[PDB]
Amino acid sequence: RRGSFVEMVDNLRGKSGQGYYVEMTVGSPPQTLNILVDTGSSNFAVGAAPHPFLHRYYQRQLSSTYRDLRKGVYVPYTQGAWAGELGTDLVSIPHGPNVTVRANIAAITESDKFFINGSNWEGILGLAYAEIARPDDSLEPFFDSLVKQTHVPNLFSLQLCGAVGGSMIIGGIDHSLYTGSLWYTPIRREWYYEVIIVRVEINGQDLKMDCKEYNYDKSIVDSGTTNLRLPKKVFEAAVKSIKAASSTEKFPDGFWLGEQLVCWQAGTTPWNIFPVISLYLMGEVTNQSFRITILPQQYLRPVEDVATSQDDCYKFAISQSSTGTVMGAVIMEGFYVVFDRARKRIGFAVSACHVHDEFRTAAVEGPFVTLDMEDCGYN
């Protein structure tokens, strides 16, 4: 007994805190590359010249189907940037849908703080909308091309399994990847995958901030960001509340700032002393919301520790932002997330693979009643 999308299950790999990547095959004859999956941008780009952190790269002169667009392109990220040259070529995903498309591809020739020593990936796949593509919104993103050229339904889903692997189901949903029900939140606007957060609780206790603060100046779902990032005022109140909740134990100020690690002897981490965190999201019906809840297993990330060692070290993976809330891997690793582009909504369900213990599990629950949710969005 196996689902229809079985061949797409377990098609993602990664190293903790270094993103998740899928194999993609480009050009003719085939050149296969590992590509980071990033719902927080809209450019498909691949290393195309030697670099000290690259084991392989795209060789355009060897691809008979490569077409030069005669146009440079530059993409800056929160951290990192690259410059390159636009072209098109044939692209397939071996463990994805059974189609081949002609896609825009940025050949990366120069970069700064983009590639990572020993990450195993060589490019990036921007899965968000045309509005944020560089150089402009006329450069059709990969997923747009896929839907326009083929029968593949305008939907994909992600199950990121923390410690690294997971699944990207393209064109559908695999029911073995989650338990319980899927709850949907509207995509507020098609640029980033923007959503509306209406309330935050720490161990069941409301942070009690104006919901406008949670979404100043946007809230997005972003698989290419490790952390849960919060606007400054929200970050400060959250840290205050998490500290109060974990007060049976003391940690230095720098731990909460991500500047200091704390390590426990292997297999002794007191998960139970840290609180759970809940975000409520706008639902699909007027005045209705639902909440997703994550565990410290999601927001305290282990730092390898690759070789067998006596010490489990952790970094606090909630951090501050000047560009709104980013629901990164810290959030996504608890859940199966459905990017339902066709119906302009994002679904969440408890992930079948999320890391938890015998006393607590990540959760998705509803419905709740929340009034005036429309006012929460930044304009």
Binding site: G17, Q18, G19, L36, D38, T39, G40, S41, S42, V75, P76, Y77, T78, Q79, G80, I116, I124, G126, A128, I132, Y192, D222, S223, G224, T225, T226, N227, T323
Partner: peptide
């Protein structure tokens, strides 16, 4: 960690 798009 990674920190993927900025408005610069």
């Amino acid at each position: 960690x990674v920190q993927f798009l900025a408005x610069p």
